[PDB]
Design a protein around this ligand. Structure first.
Ligand SMILES: C[As](C)(=O)[O-]
Length: 144
């Protein structure tokens, strides 16, 4: 899982996908299809295809963006202090392509770890269970 050149990205990603993953922009709350999508499968980095979240950990937090209790693999994402626009939050970015994904907060389901990963649907690509094998993610079916 690798990240193409900035120049190549400009010609493959939509304006929205590019602004969110490359410039850390934020999609309008409740605007993405993935917000209310709850079907079996996984969500991968729109840029590199790296698996990031599983349908197994997706839940309704009412925050406005796809929400998960944890990443599909602890190593899949990286955390960063975000002192953007007068406040302190923890930014979440993908490991391989370093795409801006969203933020994580300490107010998630307590029995699931207590974390809430709020992610832009524009930074993801959903792979339904029925297509995971063909897509090359067969080994991850155990995570749904
Ligand atoms: C707008 As957000 C999904 O980075 O808390």
């Amino acid at each position: 899982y690798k990240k193409p050149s900035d120049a190549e990205l400009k010609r493959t990603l939509t304006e929205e996908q590019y602004q969110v993953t490359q410039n850390s922009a934020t999609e309008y709350a409740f605007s993405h299809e993935y917000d209310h999508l709850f079907k079996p499968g996984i969500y991968v980095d729109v840029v590199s295809g790296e698996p990031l979240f599983s349908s197994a950990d997706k839940y309704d937090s009412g925050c406005g963006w796809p929400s998960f209790t944890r990443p599909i693999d602890a190593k899949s994402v990286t955390e960063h202090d975000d002192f953007s626009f007068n406040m302190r939050r923890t930014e979440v970015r993908s490991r391989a392509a370093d795409s801006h994904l969203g933020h994580v907060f300490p107010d998630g389901p307590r029995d699931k770890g207590g974390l809430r990963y709020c992610i832009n649907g524009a930074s993801l690509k959903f792979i339904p269970l029925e297509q995971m094998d063909a897509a090359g993610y067969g080994a991850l079916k155990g995570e749904v």
